[PDB]
A = this chain, B = another copy of it.
Amino acid sequence: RSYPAIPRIYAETTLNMLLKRAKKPRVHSIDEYLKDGGYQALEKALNMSPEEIIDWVDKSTLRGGGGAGFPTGKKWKFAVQNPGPRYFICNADESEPGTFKDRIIIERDPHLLIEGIIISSYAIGANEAYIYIRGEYPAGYYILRDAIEEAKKKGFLGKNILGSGFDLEIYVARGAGAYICGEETALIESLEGKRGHPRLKPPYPVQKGLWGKPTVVNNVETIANVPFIISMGWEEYRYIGPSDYAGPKLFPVSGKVKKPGVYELPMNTTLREVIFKYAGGTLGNKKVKAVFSGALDCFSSEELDIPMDYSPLGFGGTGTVIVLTEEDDIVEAALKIAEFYEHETCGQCTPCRVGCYEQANLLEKIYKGEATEQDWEGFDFVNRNIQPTSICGLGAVAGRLIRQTLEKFPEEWEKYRK
């Protein structure tokens, strides 16, 4: 019955889909979910062929909400070209700074996620599925465990689900403090009971994943779309937002805004609109100085008119929007990003291992005003050289945001070199 205490993150939707229930800050149990027509998409799905479901998800143009925006249908297609058995994994590791969109689905509308996992699993022929939830989401973990039992009792999980002949078990695994275990191959390693060490890709999981078998990894948000696609059909879904970047997307907005929280919006929304139209503008009506796209990118106040889509010029990513205003020290903020990568490199690759450490170590000296000229030159050098030989995206991006602050706010860095 009782769960650990959760802060009641604000949530708003113009689309009333992913946040239809999760916009209210409490657990929605199966009866309330069923009352809203929940699990009818599953029933429909089980009356369809796996191939047909893949087809609909493909034609929906659904993309991954885990940050890379990879077409979900195409991913599934790849998996089913490979002999079974196959595995389905729901990625609930959500640990990138500023990003708290997935947890509100987990904690408030677990059946939406579960229903999505069951459909997705059926589509790719997986009889065994996993949720990997970070260990710092203990309430989400217990909520999911209880929801799964509820689903079992109403006959949505187990053997021969609703007479369909399809069997499914969903196991819930917990992380234990490593951001890198959100990387799909390191997640799989952790599920296999090992340290979270990414594997060289290719192969991609859909070719070789859990126990070496075809495995689809999708983010919570991605999977939560699937019931809607089956329910509405792909045509109506494609009618949501702009025709190319169609469908709902979640935007966790934090920092110097009046209304921090998660916003369910179409992807033609601009960054400026997220901040000023939806999130209520800035604290104290101060000027926006920068937006940090999690720990990935830094947008200046001259880049607010971009769409929140997966276009070349679009915001992309997980739609994470951290707002800094005119008073916030960019170098101090960059330090916090450096600290994050320092604390999360898994250490496999030498430039990443030493690079993330030295970036933080040197940047701290710069910040405290204890950096020699050599420390300055060294900082510049190491920021440009975390990436070489790296086998996953962390190494590839650990210097990216900080580099952007150096390019976009030179005058503020210059003052530190004094």
Contacts and interface: CB of A to CB of B under 8 A. Distances in A.
A154 B26 contact: no
Contact of A160 (B26, B154, B160): B26
A163 B2 contact: yes
A25 B153 CA distance: 7
A79 to B, nearest CB: 27
B8 A159 contact: no
Interface residues on A, range: 10 to 19
Nearest to A259: B153
Contacts of A154: 8, 25
A8 B160 contact: no
A158 interface: yes
A27 interface: yes
Interface of A is mostly: loop
Contact of A8 (B8, B10, B153): B153
B163 A24 contact: no
Interface string A1-27: 111000010100000000000001111
Nearest to A2: B163
A3 B164 CA distance: 10
A1 B164 CA distance: 10
A177 interface: no
A393 interface: no
Interface string A146-172: 000000011100111001000000000
Nearest to A165: B1
A24 B157 CA distance: 10
A413 to B, nearest CB: 34
A158 B25 CA distance: 9
Contacts of A1: 163
Contacts of A160: 26-27
Nearest to A27: B160
A3 B163 CA distance: 8
Interface of A: 1-3, 8, 10, 24-27, 153-155, 158-160, 163
20 contacts: A1-B163, A2-B163, A3-B163, A8-B153, A8-B154, A8-B155, A10-B153, A24-B158, A24-B159, A25-B153, A25-B154, A25-B155, A25-B158, A26-B155, A26-B158, A26-B159, A26-B160, A26-B163, A27-B160, A27-B163
